[PDB]
Design a protein around this nucleic acid. Structure first.
Lengths: 58, 103, 52, 185, 148, 51
RNA sequence: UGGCGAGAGACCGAUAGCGAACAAGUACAGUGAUGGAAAGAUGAAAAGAACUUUGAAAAGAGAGUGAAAAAGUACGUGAAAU
RNA sequence: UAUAUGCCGCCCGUCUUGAAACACGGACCAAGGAGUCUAACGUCUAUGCGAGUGUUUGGGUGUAAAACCCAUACGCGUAAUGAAAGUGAACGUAGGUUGGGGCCUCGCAAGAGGUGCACAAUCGACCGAUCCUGAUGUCUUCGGAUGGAUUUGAGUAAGAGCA
RNA sequence: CUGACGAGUAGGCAGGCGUGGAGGUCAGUGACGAAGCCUAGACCGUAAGGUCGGGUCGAACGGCCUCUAGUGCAGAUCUUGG
């Protein structure tokens, strides 16, 4: 009572029915995984430059 | 009618004629077969009490919480709006209704 | 400026009295809400039928 | 026998007419097809393709969002357009003057806009006033604020709210939600 | 709706939309939530994670009347005043005529802050308040009176 | 225990009755449903209170 | 959802509706507990065919009643298989 | 429409990789005959109202199992988060950047500048939990201010739900 | 008006034909003959099917706008009858 164990025939043809999807990179990719020391610094650097470009500009 | 003085018993025999109070105004009588428009014979007391029942800008409601509905267009005629003055000065001129068959 | 509906007597003879429209006759004439609500309301005097 | 690349006879997936049977909305669609065909201004093609949108795709714009749109710089005199409805918001106290034009208007919204001195305008009166769409603003209510879009794309580590009837303790907080009971999500 | 269902459009097609190979049969997966830790584990993990096990403490004979404590944001707090007196109360933004608001009278057990009541003094009567709500009420001028 | 009677919203019920009363006016929709009003005086037809 | 007395229907219309529209819990089967049918509709009214002839009789053929017996008590219309 | 003639044409349904099959059902005809109704829901539409919504458990009426009118609650929604005690959402035009339909100004036009709702990505702020920091006072060891952190939620960020 | 395209089982969706019954309308048709049945007679629609003529027959039935469903058959060693 054996049967077919595996194939990959009609697997590269199903995928190309819908056209292998490019991963949609963005401007400002997510900082999840960036080193936490640099991440804390860049948090406070953006925090500083928002103060500098909000308070000084009137 | 608005005040019954032997009117339902008077006209309950004649075929077709149905009577209805103002405060009732059944929908199953006014639009039979979901088709609009029944030839309704009002009485004068019924006409004024209809003004009291459904309300207007002056009288308020007499149905708690109810206001007569708002339109979403100001005039049911559209060609009147399309014509009048202001649109046609903003409109590019017209092509022919059926086009020439070139080639 | 309501269009001043006149009142008829019992013997015809349209009387000089006049009445304004009660502003129900300027409501939105909606055939579709009347249609669907008429179907849902007309199903409300049905009795139960069933087999044993 | 043509070798085809994409779908034969592909219905575009957009609407061409509103699925609703409201007669007066079909009259507004009748008017804006004329204006979108013969004014060649883009405003008439954004109103026309927002009348076709459904009830979920026309979420209601609170009158406080109209207050934010009139606190916007250089836009204090624009006549704001909301294809859809306009609902009242009881959280604002100062409301500005100018014109709001929508399909519908809730009762508190007309009360507040007329109380502040403004004028509520149905879209055909705006088409009389602004044929090419002179001096307007189109707002949209939030679409991803729904109770149903709160649950879309439910899966592991995606943080999107399991469809559930009764919440609290004891209902989907065990194995698969915390570390001590197996895994977390 | 019987004339609108698709099993009336299937009159003429052998299997009525259920398939010839995989025949429509009685209960092929089980009755109900069968096999939750079994052949449906991939459906008890994702879309329902956390369905299996215990989490908390048992509260024998729980009465929800004990836990009646609806909240009121400072965003509303003026809809408790009726709309006719509200404009007379926003004007004369001053003491000695502060509008008494009994928040319990509409059924609110706690007053929470959510942003910027106007500068009119207000005597909020409540059972519970939150710390960032009473600071905003006090900064508006009015005070909070604890009732029961 | 088939569902025999159907709920309608109360305000939509009043909406439909309001649209029916508004349709009992000027008689395109009244001449549409038969209703031989081809020779009448003006519509809405109001008769005196004596009736 | 039992008994009696009532009113009704977006139900079924005689292979349906109760098992039962009829002498239906009947005919019938089983030692018994029990099982359990089929079967309505000539015409307005029997006026349901006097009389003659063929045949031993059933019947036929004429005659006649009937709007019509291409309605004759195997009876309304009377399909398909055959 | 019948027949003659030329060429073609294996009985349908079914499982099946494949049946005209030496696979199974089918002698014929008439009638009956198989995804229906309900409870709770999901997604999508349409309608009413919309910070609400829901008349119909019940009451008054009635041309009386219909229609009509209605109080009080109650259900869902308007607030989350914790096992729980409990606490419970604006530093800032409720933010910053990028991309944005449309609108405004200049320009004949192409375009340039401003404004940028929805939506997409991302950095912040705030609310609850967790882990830290833990000051003034102190029914003298209770109490939490401030400051945080690659932690965490089905949160907020001028409400979108109800029927 | 212009252009492109048209295999399809399981399957999905759309536009529709038919049936029993319900609200409306055509002041519809009809014992000077409705419904039904037969009809190598005819017309329309791609098709579901609709329509007419002839015969038979004997009292009810349709078009359209909507509603509702015990709604459509060649097959189930399908049920009953022949």
């Amino acid at each position: 009572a054996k049967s077919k164990n595996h194939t990959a025939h009609n697997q590269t043809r199903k995928a190309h029915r819908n056209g292998i999807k490019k991963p949609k990179t963005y401007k400002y990719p997510s900082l999840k995984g960036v080193d936490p020391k640099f991440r804390r610094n860049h948090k406070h650097a953006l925090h500083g430059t928002a103060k500098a470009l909000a308070a000084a500009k009137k | 009618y608005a005040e019954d003085n032997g009117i339902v018993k008077a006209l309950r025999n004649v075929p077709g004629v149905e009577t209805a109070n103002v405060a009732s105004l059944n929908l199953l009588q006014l639009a039979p077969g979901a088709h609009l428009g029944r030839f309704v014979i009002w009485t004068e007391a019924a006409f004024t009490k209809l003004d009291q029942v459904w309300g207007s800008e002056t009288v308020a409601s007499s149905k708690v919480g109810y206001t007569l509905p708002s339109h979403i267009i100001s005039t049911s005629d559209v060609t009147r709006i399309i014509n009048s003055s202001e649109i046609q000065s903003a409109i590019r001129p017209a092509g022919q209704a059926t086009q020439k068959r070139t080639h | 400026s309501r269009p001043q509906v006149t009142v008829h007597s019992l013997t015809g003879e349209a009387t000089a009295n006049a009445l304004p429209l009660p502003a129900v006759f300027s409501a939105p004439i909606r055939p579709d809400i009347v249609h669907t609500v008429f179907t849902s309301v007309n199903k409300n005097k049905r009795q139960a039928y069933a087999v044993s | 026998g043509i070798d085809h690349t994409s779908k034969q006879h592909k219905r575009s997936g957009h609407r061409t007419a509103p699925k609703s049977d409201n007669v007066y909305l079909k009259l507004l669609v009748k008017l804006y097809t004329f204006l979108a065909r013969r004014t060649d201004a883009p405003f008439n093609k954004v109103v026309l393709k927002a009348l076709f949108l459904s009830k979920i795709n026309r979420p209601p714009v609170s009158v406080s969002r109209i207050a934010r749109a009139l606190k916007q710089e250089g836009a204090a005199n624009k006549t704001v357009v909301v294809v859809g409805t306009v609902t009242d918001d009881a959280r604002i106290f100062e409301f500005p003057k100018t014109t709001v034009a929508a399909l519908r208007f809730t009762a508190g919204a007309r009360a507040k806009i007329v109380k502040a001195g403004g004028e509520c305008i149905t879209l055909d009166q705006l088409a009389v006033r602004a044929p090419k769409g002179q001096n307007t603003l189109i707002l949209r209510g939030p679409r991803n604020s729904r109770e149903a879009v709160r649950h879309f794309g439910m899966g592991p580590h995606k943080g999107k709210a399991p469809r559930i009837l009764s919440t609290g303790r004891k209902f989907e907080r065990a194995r698969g939600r915390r570390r001590s009971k197996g895994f977390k999500v | 709706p019987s004339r609108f269902t698709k099993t009336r459009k299937h009159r003429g097609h052998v299997s009525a939309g259920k398939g010839r190979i995989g025949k429509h049969r009685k209960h092929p997966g089980g009755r109900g939530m069968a096999g939750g830790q079994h052949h449906h584990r991939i459906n008890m993990d994702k879309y329902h994670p956390g369905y299996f096990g215990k989490v908390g403490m048992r509260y024998f004979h729980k009465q929800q009347a004990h836990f009646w404590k609806p909240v009121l944001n400072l965003d509303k707090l003026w809809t408790l005043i009726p709309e006719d007196k509200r404009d007379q109360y926003l004007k004369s933004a001053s003491k000695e005529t502060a509008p008494v608001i009994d928040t319990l009278a509409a059924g609110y057990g706690k007053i929470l802050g959510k942003g910027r009541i106007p500068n009119v003094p207000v005597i909020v009567k409540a059972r519970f308040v939150s710390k960032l709500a009473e600071e905003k009420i006090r900064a508006a001028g009015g005070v909070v009176e604890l009732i029961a | 225990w088939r569902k025999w009677n159907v709920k309608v919203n109360h305000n939509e019920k009043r909406y439909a009755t309001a649209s029916a009363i508004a349709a009992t006016a000027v008689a395109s929709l009244v001449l549409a449903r038969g209703h031989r009003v081809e020779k009448i005086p003006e519509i809405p037809l109001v008769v005196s209170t004596d009736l």
